[PDB]
Amino acid sequence: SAYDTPLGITNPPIDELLSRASSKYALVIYAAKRARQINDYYNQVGPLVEPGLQEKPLSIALREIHGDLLEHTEGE
Amino acid sequence: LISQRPTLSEETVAENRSRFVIEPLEPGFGYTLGNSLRRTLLSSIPGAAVTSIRIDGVLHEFTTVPGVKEDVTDIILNLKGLVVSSDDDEPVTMYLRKQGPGVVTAGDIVPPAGVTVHNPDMHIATLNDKGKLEVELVVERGRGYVPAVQNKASGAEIGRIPVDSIYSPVLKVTYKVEATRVEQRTDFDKLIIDVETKNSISPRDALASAGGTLVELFGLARELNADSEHIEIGP
Amino acid sequence: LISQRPTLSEETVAENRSRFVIEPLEPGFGYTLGNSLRRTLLSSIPGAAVTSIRIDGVLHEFTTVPGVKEDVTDIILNLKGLVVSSDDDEPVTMYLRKQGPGVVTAGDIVPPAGVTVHNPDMHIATLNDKGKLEVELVVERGRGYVPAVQNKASGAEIGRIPVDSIYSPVLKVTYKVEATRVEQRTDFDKLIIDVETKNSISPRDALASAGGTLVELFGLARELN
Amino acid sequence: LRVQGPREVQIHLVKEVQEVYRAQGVSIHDKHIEVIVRQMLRRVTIIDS
Amino acid sequence: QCGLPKLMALELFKPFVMKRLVDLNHAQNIKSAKRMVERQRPQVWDVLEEVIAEHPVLLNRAPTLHRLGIQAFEPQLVEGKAIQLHPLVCEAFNADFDGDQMAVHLPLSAEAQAEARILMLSSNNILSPASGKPLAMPRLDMVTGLYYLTTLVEGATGEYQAATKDAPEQGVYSSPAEAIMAMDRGALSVRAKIKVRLTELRPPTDLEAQLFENGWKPGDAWTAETTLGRVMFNELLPKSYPFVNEQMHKKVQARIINDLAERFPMIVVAQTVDKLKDAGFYWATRSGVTVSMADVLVPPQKQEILERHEAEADAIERKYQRGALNHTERNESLVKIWQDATEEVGKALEEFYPADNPIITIVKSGATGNLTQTRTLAGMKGLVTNPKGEFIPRPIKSSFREGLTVLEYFINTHGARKGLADTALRTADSGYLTRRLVDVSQDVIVREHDCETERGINVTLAERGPDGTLIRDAHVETSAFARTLATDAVDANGNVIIERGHDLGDPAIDALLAAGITTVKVRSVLTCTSATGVCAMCYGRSMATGKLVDIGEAVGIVAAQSIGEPGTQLTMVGGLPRVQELFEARVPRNKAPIADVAGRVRLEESDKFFKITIVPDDGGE
Amino acid sequence: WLSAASFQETTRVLTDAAINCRSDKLNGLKENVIIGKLIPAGTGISRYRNIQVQPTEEARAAA
Amino acid sequence: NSVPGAPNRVSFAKLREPLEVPGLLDVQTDSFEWLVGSDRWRQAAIDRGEENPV
Amino acid sequence: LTHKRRLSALGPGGLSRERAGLEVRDVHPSHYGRMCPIETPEGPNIGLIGSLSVYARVNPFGFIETPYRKVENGVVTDQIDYLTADEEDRHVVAQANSPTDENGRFTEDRVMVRKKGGEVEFVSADQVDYMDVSPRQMVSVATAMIPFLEHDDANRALMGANMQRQAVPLVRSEAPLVGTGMELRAAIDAGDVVVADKTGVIEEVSADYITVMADDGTRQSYRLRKFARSNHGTCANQRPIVDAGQRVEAGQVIADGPCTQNGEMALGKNLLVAIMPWEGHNYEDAIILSNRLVEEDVLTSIHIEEHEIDARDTKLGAEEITRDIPNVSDEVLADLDERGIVRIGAEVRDGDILVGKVTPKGETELTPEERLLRAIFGEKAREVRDTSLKVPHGESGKVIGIRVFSREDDDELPAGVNELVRVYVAQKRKISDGDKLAGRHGNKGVIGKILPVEDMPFLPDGTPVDIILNTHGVPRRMNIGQILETHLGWVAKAGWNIDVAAGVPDWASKLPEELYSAPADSTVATPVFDGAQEGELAGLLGSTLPNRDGEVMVDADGKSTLFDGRSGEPFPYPVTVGYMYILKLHHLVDDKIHARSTGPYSMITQQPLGGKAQFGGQRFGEMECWAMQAYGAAYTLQELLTIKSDDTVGRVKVYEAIVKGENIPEPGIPESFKVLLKELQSLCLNVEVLS
Ligand SMILES: [Mg+2]
Ligand SMILES: [Zn+2]
């Protein structure tokens, strides 16, 4: 709801992220897959959100998930 | 000569609230700056405020005023919330008169020459139907926060209410010191000071006034030996 | 309000100790002012101190010298207490020579022009019959405490013994606050600050230096027009 | 277990363990202890095949 | 955040640092970058801070008794060689700064980094998975600060005074800023009761209802009767939290944190705990709490009580010399007399000490310690045990504040050594038990959402006696809370209060007790019919997260760790050996026969034995 | 038999397993770590492990 | 008093010591002297009330 | 000293640590006067290892005897008898601290005694037949040096006694203001100080030797050890204290030892302490120190380490100590002596060459790329490979000594060894964050923050404090003796004078005359179980001398008003302030910090080695795996157990991926499982993997 600006890796807030995933494990694998895709693109889809100066792939993937720019499924 | 000259940066938080960052200053000087800066800022800038009041509707049992729903304490607090600016550094008398149902605010006071009101929208009280409010206020200039001066010797004139005086335009000051890095060394201190003043002045002006006051005070000590090896800063 | 600017007056307790009274000040103002003065006086006053030493017949500080009661480490510790005053802002060299029976004190050093030793009676070492002590010391100007600089970083040859330098002439600074009467009321307060110095620099000079540092620092705050 | 039944023995075990633990002032939810008891009660001795 | 030494971080991130050195043209190849890193040239440290950014590291402290023994932190370089650890996590790690060491591990893969950043992040693990109580909450000094901040003291400077016929109310301030100004001039004590007009703090529920029918909004003014310290404390809590206006005991803070966790997002709790930490340290520094030989006050009535009980003991001894009582009887009588003396001395000590004594202040605030420690420090040591374990009927009257004599010290050493030796082996026994528990229960994993079963177990909530009103069961937090209802609860008439599949919280039990329900059937793992593992609904809600357990969680390991973690603090029969006997399902030492069938009992005392015969009411066997 | 041997009585467990000739299916949360295969709990189960990710068309168009 | 040097150190002791503290290394040296056999050990054994020590 | 008086229950014919129950390790009444109940290990060896008491003696049969005073007809007699446990079990022994008249007859009507079963009882004065020799008969040497021991709990006393044996020597030592009378005797008994053998007059005093001309014509020369490394790498340095032309007597100390000052035992430093919490930096036993202790080297210590290298014979030819090493920059070998050994006085750092050595290679079989690289540069395929002795990781310091042994000049070295070189490196360590300090009452703690002088709270005269200790420790740990130590230390530092105008004060009635007044910086002694009493300490606090300005900083309650160094305002309440003896334990973060990224591996299991000696990897134990499973961190656990431990191919591929900036490859099949499979294949088990 109302909170101070998150710092470090607490940004984006975990509650918003979990609102877009079935559980913590699903979010973890979702972010990991997106980060691996971003790194593979870096070393030959690229990052959608404008990456920072030297933002790591994982942070970019988390920001993309927070922005709702991506989607996922659960194979089983 | 210093290692690296510090700089001051301002960021506005609200209309009458701001934050200042001084960085990078050498280790140990963060508190040295901040504490004295806060004390001067909140206790050295001169201003004006209401110091005593007298309501014609009450002479004893200062509980309630006839014709108004608000009690005496609420009226006193609302008046304490008033913002004034005089230019004669001597006591002056202001009069507030209202009649009939409605709401009486700061804009209803008639000020004499020099006195000014910066928050005419400040609600003072609610005058009930067929009610009259007639109050007088004493205004003069001062420094800092002064507790209500007693009137125990006013036995010949009882009915006036002395109130706590808030002369300082600055209302609340906070400061903190954080670690910061320059090049490879992380010992440097960054000073962050949050200020918020009344409607009659901006934080920048109060900061400048406090800086000038401190500069004068410490020049009082520096004048002993002008040709001394003081740590210079450069341009 | 009142219109009376504060004034500062000094009294002398001893040759190297003084008290300064600043009055009148606003209530609850003396403590912070005195603390700021004390902090600056203890952490910003420049001075002079020995930066390194070299003895004729040693290579490191973990050995001894023939005919000398004290070893090299104890000699360095004793020299730590030496108080010196320099003029130029470049390293200067002092020489200490002694032979035969006796005690080597701080008064046996032969300082060049511009270098002064204010505690000639300080004890350094003792030589019994065959002690031949030959030392060269390096004096510089600085501020605060600086740890010994390694030889490799400074590009020095074996034999030089870097030592910790303490560029601080002030020993003890304290303050107190008392009430003082004014036409307004007894609210205002007077600040009495007591300073004791190494005798290398007068207390008034140190106070002036601290005041100048604080003035120049608060110039940044005053620069907002 | 033999006389009263499987439902009681787990009650007895949980109650005893909780009593021992809370005698020292330790709060453990009964779900952990009953998970351990559930693992303890999973097999049957075959009398005749 | 955690503080990582520069050298340790450089060694851990050497490959990343080499990559960032070669790609930035500081080194021409990998060999040059490695050579530069080994000599630690200045360019290395500039790249090191860039590399470590947003790269979590796992901190561990052995022994890892439970889940929270390993936690992920965001590193930051610090001068020196010691790791800097956040004070709030010390409870989870069981760490103290008397020489302890921690191990640092660096996740490499993206999956590992995501797991550390989400699953194992320190700020996301506030609550204990065992009981659900908060762990990263103020303790020790912090509490002693907040306590002092919120305690109210009468007759303080600037205390509120009611209006009279001569002057109006005195201690009224227009805003908290005015109160701070008054405090800065020695005119208002931080702990003095006052009336203050607040605008940015939400009033309590009942005051809000009585004052604002349309709902309080920011900017609305209301007068509050409280101290400046409480006002400052309430500014640390989130904006929407109602005003508390209460002294901050340990349990009060725990209750507030639990309320925040239930009703607010996890980030808000993490920020609030940091704000509380800062305020607690700041006000503990200035609380005036200190230890001095004078502060340790002695009760003036101690001497009279000791002399009276010495006279009683002398009477018992003179009786013994006659021969009326045996050695065991004499010992028992002396033990009873000295227990009474110790209790009276403790009562006198508690009564005599003033409210603001630092020693009593620390204990009462709940920061640490207990009243027995104070009693033995100032009042009297009491009785001590011999190697055999029996009480010695010669108490150590002199307290340590006075100083024990030689013989009292020698006898006390026996109990001290026994306790130390017991603690030495408690750890090993608990570790072995935890290993067995983990191994047996490793197969219990949540595999599906629900097994769709109507079965469950009955749990009692309250009992009604002659008083009429049903009284709540003491052990309800560990039995009824965090569970699911197997069947709908129906009152006497037949109305349904709570439907099946509902989480049982505090409001649910409050409603059930009002309706007159005393027993409820709840789904349990013991009755789960899932083919593999268990199901989420039967297990209930995860204590740590406070939500329904998610599929794939290894509840068995969590249960084993929860059981084993408090093993180290169980006496060594009604302790850890008792727990081992219960879990091993072996024949108890003091076996008690169980009535096979109802009937009438008979007995025959025999040589060193009893014999009991039960004759069934129905039947003849 | 892997987990039983790892727990206690390795010799007896291995002897009984040998004479019985009983094979082990590698899903026990304790033999998976021995084999080096990721455990079948938490993120390791098939549901979460086999998640598929691809950007939405709306975000893909913006690029 | 035993040590000629005896740096000054006032004592709160109220009881006079009737016996001086014995040698703190005697446990090792006396045992080793017994092992090898030394003239002083022989003299001490003779004085202690034993004849023909071995 | 304490090592030589150690009684151990282990060893051949003794107990086993895994087969020792509670009964054996518990204190037994017979221990009184023979085995100290306090001094004993804290860990699993609790109660199995102890220390001999001060007065205890060993019977030739091996039983421990203790002395007692013969008392007959209720009169203490000068006769002393050594009794054994079974022998004393037949007697009634009275405690030493019992009132007695000048004649010797007991003043009281009833006396405290121990009976056969070790039970404590009141008995008539005529029933006692033996008496304790001294009040401290039960304590050991170390336990005897804890002032106010009777005011400290057993656990904390044990901790303090154990800690006393870990103090490292400092550059300069000073005796405590407040202590026991043992420090002196112990220092002489340890044998580290030099005592004149015969009475005489000192002839020559140098830093290396002391020559004394005896009273007769005999003259003796004593050699002083200088900067000699001890068994644990601590400097052992003896220095003279006598002066030329000074008369000395037999048994008089003429040179101080490592941790001695003027013939007394000085393990730590006495420094100003304030008991209060400060901004949470002393939270949970942490300690704050003033920067002065660093500037003045108050807590500085010298540490020496030895490095050994040997040149021996090989089947390919002998290895030689040479000054030329293949593929080395000319600058690297700049401080090497002509023989190849480092030069004395040099400043070696991590990875620096100490001794130059080379060994024959034999076969080369250089790779094609290396062959081409050498061809393009015209570099010889040198016969020898470099094996020089290099400084270990994280070490530093000056080179002080070098020793060389060469088989040519005698030097009876082990067979095959032709040269042996030892290099001694000494470094001066200052107190820093993470170092462990402690008192004599078991109040240990690590340093969390070191502040500048201006930040520490200071007395109203301007004196800043040196250490800040948290107030939340004492009451719950039951070591209140440290507060009394602080009070008496403050009393000792600032002289005291008891006014005797109106007679003597009641509290000071039993004080000896010598304690009526003392000057500043006067040391005091408070023997255990016989020392400064409560009321005496209170009165001495109330009767201290003023400072240079004729005022008292500390009030009669022992508290003083401090000023906040940072803000500058005085603290609202007075704070306890005094002097405490703080000693530096041998637990320094300097020698325990190592980290690892890649290093040596095991021969068989191929897992990383452990220990700081090598590039030891931290063990991820079973409990850590349980925690990871509880979190559900399947991937982190998998990478920990395969990639980072023994996935031989995975290790190098992951290093390559990280260096190249690529995704981490998939793990597979740790080597330990393959070793297990091929080990079970032995002893006839048909283990196989199916698909
Ligand atoms: Mg610890
Ligand atoms: Zn189920």
Side-chain angles (χ1 to χ4, degrees), chain B residues 24-51:
Chain B
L25 61 83
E26 292 185 274
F29 268 105
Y31 302 97
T32 309
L33 271 298
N35 190 228
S36 194
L37 189 61
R38 161 161 185 283
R39 289 305 320 162
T40 313
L41 206 64
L42 195 82
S43 182
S44 287
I45 298 166
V50 177
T51 62

Side-chain angles (χ1 to χ4, degrees), chain C residues 152-212:
Chain C
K152 274 192 172 323
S154 190
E157 69 275 16
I158 286 159
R160 187 79 56 100
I161 303 171
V163 306
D164 316 314
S165 314
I166 316 182
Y167 310 103
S168 169
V170 188
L171 282 83
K172 185 179 282 187
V173 183
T174 192
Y175 56 77
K176 65 179 73 174
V177 171
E178 310 190 343
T180 196
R181 188 170 56 123
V182 193
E183 310 305 316
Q184 176 268 346
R185 223 186 184 274
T186 53
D187 288 345
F188 287 72
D189 60 45
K190 63 176 259 175
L191 165 62
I192 306 151
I193 181 164
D194 189 8
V195 179
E196 181 177 25
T197 315
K198 276 189 169 76
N199 213 56
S200 180
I201 192 166
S202 180
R204 54 181 291 91
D205 306 330
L207 190 59
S209 177

Side-chain angles (χ1 to χ4, degrees), chain E residues 521-601:
Chain E
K521 191 189 211 184
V522 300
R523 308 187 60 179
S524 183
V525 170
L526 279 164
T527 63
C528 195
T529 70
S530 196
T532 61
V534 294
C535 78
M537 295 288 282
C538 276
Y539 179 70
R541 65 182 180 179
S542 178
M543 304 312 299
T545 62
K547 278 154 278 160
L548 187 64
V549 69
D550 46 356
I551 299 96
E553 178 154 304
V555 299
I557 306 294
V558 170
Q561 291 186 318
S562 308
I563 300 277
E565 192 274 323
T568 58
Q569 73 207 47
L570 311 172
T571 300
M572 293 177 70
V573 306
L576 184 60
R578 181 62 184 142
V579 177
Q580 295 187 0
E581 287 206 320
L582 282 150
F583 276 125
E584 284 293 307
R586 62 174 64 146
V587 181
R589 274 321 201 161
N590 270 267
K591 168 163 183 163
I594 190 168
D596 183 13
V597 65
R600 310 213 86 88
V601 67

Side-chain angles (χ1 to χ4, degrees), chain B residues 38-39 42 60-62 71 73-74 76-78 80 145-147 161 164 166 168 170-172 181 184, chain E residues 6 42 45-46 49 79 163-169 172-174 177-178 180-182 184-185 197 223:
Chain B
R38 161 161 185 283
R39 289 305 320 162
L42 195 82
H60 293 88
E61 194 179 39
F62 293 100
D71 63 358
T73 307
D74 186 74
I76 287 163
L77 296 200
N78 293 114
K80 281 200 191 164
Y145 178 80
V146 177
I161 314 190
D164 310 324
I166 296 166
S168 64
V170 190
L171 282 153
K172 188 176 175 69
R181 214 164 42 70
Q184 194 178 337
Chain E
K6 274 157 53 180
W45 307 113
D46 305 336
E49 191 176 340
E79 297 297 340
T164 74
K165 291 196 293 179
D166 312 290
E169 320 162 65
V172 186
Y173 298 87
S174 81
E178 192 190 336
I180 294 164
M181 293 180 183
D184 292 350
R185 272 186 46 132
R197 173 190 303 232
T223 291

Side-chain angles (χ1 to χ4, degrees), chain E residues 319-384:
Chain E
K319 210 79 78 187
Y320 174 62
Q321 285 295 336
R322 293 159 63 81
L325 298 173
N326 320 318
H327 181 273
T328 186
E329 269 284 17
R330 192 203 88 174
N331 287 22
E332 273 181 58
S333 183
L334 289 172
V335 165
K336 191 174 186 289
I337 297 169
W338 296 128
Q339 286 276 346
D340 291 331
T342 309
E343 186 50 81
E344 293 179 354
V345 166
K347 254 172 151 193
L349 196 156
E350 293 170 19
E351 274 281 21
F352 165 67
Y353 263 66
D356 57 59
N357 184 266
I359 311 306
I360 293 294
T361 291
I362 289 165
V363 177
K364 297 288 189 63
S365 61
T368 193
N370 66 48
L371 279 161
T372 299
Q373 289 158 350
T374 307
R375 184 224 59 198
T376 183
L377 172 61
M380 82 189 299
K381 179 51 177 145
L383 297 156
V384 298

